[PDB]
Amino acid sequence: LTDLPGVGPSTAEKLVEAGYIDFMKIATATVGELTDIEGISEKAAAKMIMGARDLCDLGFKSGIDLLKQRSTVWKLSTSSSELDSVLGGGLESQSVTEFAGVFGSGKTQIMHQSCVNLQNPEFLFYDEEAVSKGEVAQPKAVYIDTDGTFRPERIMQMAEHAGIDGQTVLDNTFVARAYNSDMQMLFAEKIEDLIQEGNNIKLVVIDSLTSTFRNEYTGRGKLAERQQKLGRHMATLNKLADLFNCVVLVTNQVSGHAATFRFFVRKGKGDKRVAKLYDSPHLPDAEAIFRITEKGIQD
């Protein structure tokens, strides 16, 4: 951090204790966040931010550089050919993908499958030129279980059929049981701490995203506070996805959020499930047929 203009050893310590350890978090921080660090003037705050931006080469980009920026996005397979195809390759890092649908449609299943697939190196599609092995090495997932439906057995089972060690998935998956939106949001924010602790978080799951909010802000007369809180939460999830180049997944029970990809999943005949991609920035609306068996997501 002392590389940063105006940042000496003493300021560097105040910065590390305030959570600001890497350049990107400073380069993208507001003069407000830092000035609040106390002992950090607004002058020093603006200088180090300007400095960090330069160090991280933030600025106008054009031509081939646009393709290169886009290439830093890696993708996680869902184990369903149909789905991956409709996703334009697989779940995208640096973005939030939402799977909404009726109870039993398979939302939680997809969440578990993703935690497993993260441990299958061949399931992470990326341009070796924009993303180095080390960046996706020893990947870890964080699962914010809001409904209390995380099932280690299911992880073990899906892993087995994938030919990978189930215990290895468990060892690399942090689960956080949230009983309300406050815990849910806080846990989400604490993810930076796990990364700071050396954990290569590459997959974040929020299952579910809206349950707590709906239960807490049932009154549609105070739908204001709710739509707000949820917005801040989503903003936090999106920033996480970008800064730490990781895949963020959230589920929504349904009988509009800031998710960059939005799916509506419905039950087909028996095993069959239909995932309808209805919102994305560059892909056409399309349906993917897959199934849910003892092996997890397949087809």
Ligand X SMILES: Nc1ncnc2c1ncn2[C@@H]1O[C@H](COP(=O)(O)OP(=O)(O)O)[C@@H](O)[C@H]1O
272 binds ligand X (CB under 6 A): no
Element (H, E) at 206: strand 201-207
Q: Which of 79, 93, 94, 109 binds ligand X (CB under 6 A)?
A: 109
Q: Which of 25, 75, 107, 202 binds ligand X (CB under 6 A)?
A: 107
Count of positions on this chain that bind ligand X (CB under 6 A) = 13
146 binds ligand X (CB under 6 A): no
What's the one-letter identity of residue 208? S
The interaxial angle of helices 107-117 and 152-162, nearest 10 deg, is 60
What are the binding residues for ATP? 101-108
Query: Rounded distance, CA 186 to CA 192, Å?
Result: 11
Encode 207-221: b = buried (16+ Cβ within 10 Å), e = exposed: bbbbbbbeeebeeee
39 binds ligand X (CB under 6 A): no
Shortest distance (Å) from residue 110 CB to ligand X: 7
* DSSP one-letter string for 36-100: TTSS--HHHHHHHHHHHHHHTT-S---THHHHHHHHT--EE--S-HHHHHHTTSSEEBTEEEEEE
Which of residues 243 and 286 has its CB atom nearest to Mg ion in the complex?
Answer: 243
Which of residues 90 and 101 has its CB atom nearest to ligand X in the complex?
Answer: 101
Q: Which of 90, 106, 139, 166 binds ligand X (CB under 6 A)?
A: 106
- What residues form DSSP beta bridges with 250? 206
75 binds ligand X (CB under 6 A): no
212 binds ligand X (CB under 6 A): no
114 binds, among Mg ion, ligand X, none (CB under 5 to 8 A by kind): none
242 binds, among ligand X, Mg ion, none (CB under 5 to 8 A by kind): Mg ion
2 binds ligand X (CB under 6 A): no
Query: Rounded distance, CA 11 to CA 14, Å?
Result: 5
Which residues lie near ligand X (CB under 6 A)?
A: 101, 103-109, 154, 157, 292-294
Which residues lie near Mg ion (CB under 5 A)?
A: 94-95, 107-108, 241-242
